[PDB]
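User: Transcriptional regulator ERG, Homo sapiens:
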Amino acid sequence: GSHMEEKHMPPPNMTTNERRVIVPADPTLWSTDHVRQWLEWAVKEYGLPDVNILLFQNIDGKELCKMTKDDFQRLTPSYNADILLSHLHYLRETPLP
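Assistant: Predicted structure for Transcriptional regulator ERG:
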């Protein structure tokens, strides 16, 4: 029973994405797919080999805005956790209002 697969993908969110990933400058409202979007695109921009990105597929911004350096280290440890999070926390330094 697999129907309307594209419905599981939330519509593009904020225009606060600037010219970046179509995601709010507050990694809180990055939707389930939009987290995986950057997260995928993140390994892509930052050269992250040790990253199990397909583990965050069920994590959206509300859950990643939560994530601490420890939480990434159980899915994607060492330097990769720090890369991702150090990007996320700076992104929300200028959040969507």
